[PDB]
Amino acid sequence: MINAIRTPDQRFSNLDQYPFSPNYLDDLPGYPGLRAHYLDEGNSDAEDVFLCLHGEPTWSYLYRKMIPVFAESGARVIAPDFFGFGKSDKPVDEEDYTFEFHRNFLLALIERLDLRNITLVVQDWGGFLGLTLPMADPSRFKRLIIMNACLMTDPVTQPAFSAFVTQPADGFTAWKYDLVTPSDLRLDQFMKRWAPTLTEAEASAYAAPFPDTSYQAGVRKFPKMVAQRDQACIDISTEAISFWQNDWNGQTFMAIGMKDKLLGPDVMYPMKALINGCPEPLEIADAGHFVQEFGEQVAREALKHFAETE
Template identity: 65%
Template sequence: MTQVLRTPETRFENLKDYPFGPNYVSELKGYEGIRGHYLDEGDAGSDEVFLLLHGEPTWSYLYRKMIPVFAETGARVIAPDLIGFGKSDKPVSEQTHTFEFHRNYLLQLIEHLNLNNITLVVQDWGGLLGLTLPQAMPERFKRLIIMNTGLLMEPVTQPAFLEWKSDIVDPEELALDTFMKKYAPTLDDEEAYAYAAPFPDESYKAAVRKMPKMVANPEQACIEISSAAVPFWSTQWQGHTFMAVGMKDKMLGPVVMNHMQQLIKGCPEPMQVPEAGHFVQEFGKEVAEAALKHFNL
């Protein structure tokens, strides 16, 4: 049985701009003893689904500005917390946190909730994982909204990433509120606290610590699965795509996103968000509204 910690509910009380009720799933196959959390907003009976996947080191709080915009269309809006993040349980061993561990959880969650007609919304690790999901179940996916992310097919060594990795891995005590303010300087103190809320102390941060190491040295399964996503997106993808780029992001900004635009079949010219850095969702209301306009929703 995987050893996990569960963040006390008191840590999530009265978070700024996060009025959403919790939903939990337990005992998915291979995840026995682990409780996962997801938001389920909008119309639960809708045929249209927005699936919002966060990255490192965030959680569903990241999508607080986009969820209401998508829900107003009458769609169902699902925003999971990856295992080890947010209100989901936190496996304490870094060895638990592999690419396939997190990817398979998302695949099982989609099947468990029987999600179809999915508009996939991804950024950072939400994309590193999420962009490999449709190839396994293409009939479930209809649209893509992609922000500052890519596919992980080789070790990443660029200076901006190495600084990011160092900021997470090196400190004995990782102050996530301070980290988030560095990479999302528009955050106020309450918002920065909310991002740090799931992690009362270092014992809760195994997933946060592991993610950058996985980017620096991806496992073979990650490379193979991610490489298989390339022909899917370039030749097999039949859905509609919207791209938004946080232009101040030195790690997964314009250069990487230009490559992704060329890779994804039918991807139009991206929406440039001049003031946004890595966490494009902090400008999420404008991005969501532009995406809906693009899709005529």
């Protein structure tokens, strides 16, 4: 039904610092015959569950440094790869990818696995999407760990969440340009540019999922989605705001990658205010858009702030 392709297993043979066994789901309601990859780490019977959501143009490999810390704290860690990324199947048409197709996969994943006591860990699109989930079933979510992300609302209700799109020229505009224009997109090169401390092994872990351009419709659509927000995205992100603001009564931990030219301080401070109970943020001076590449620290600190309330 949905036309898609699978990256060959051999492409991940040699991953650096990714000894996590794959778990797959190919029987999700609404995603018939579409195989979803997810990591399931730590005690599966854990009371607490860390749901790690990635963004553009990454995968669960991005949480590799955080997974072990949360796992060793006694928690179960779920880190799914969105359709189109990592080890999941990749629809070939850009048209197939929408906000709801990604948001509905997540709700379906959460129901199938029957996840409760969720500690939501988001960044980028893991955040644009992630942050609109608790409102569809608030009993499942207990805490939030938020890194450089925001809500895809309209330009009017939250200008701080729309302004980076146009300025600066070396922020979102250049990131976008890098992603949707080359006809030979090398993710390793793109990552080394946007996450400068990555080693060479690391960066190729990022290109692993896409042998050629036919595997990158999904990577190409995300950016266009931030730039051209559909009505359901807008309505949904807009309702989320209200949830964060009046209904959320969970524990929150915020971390900011201060060198981010996209979702920096100028986006995170105003998000901080919409989140009821949001403490003061952990500013990571050396971190850029991929705060997870400085994950150990963010994970230790967070479990640290959360335990000082149990």
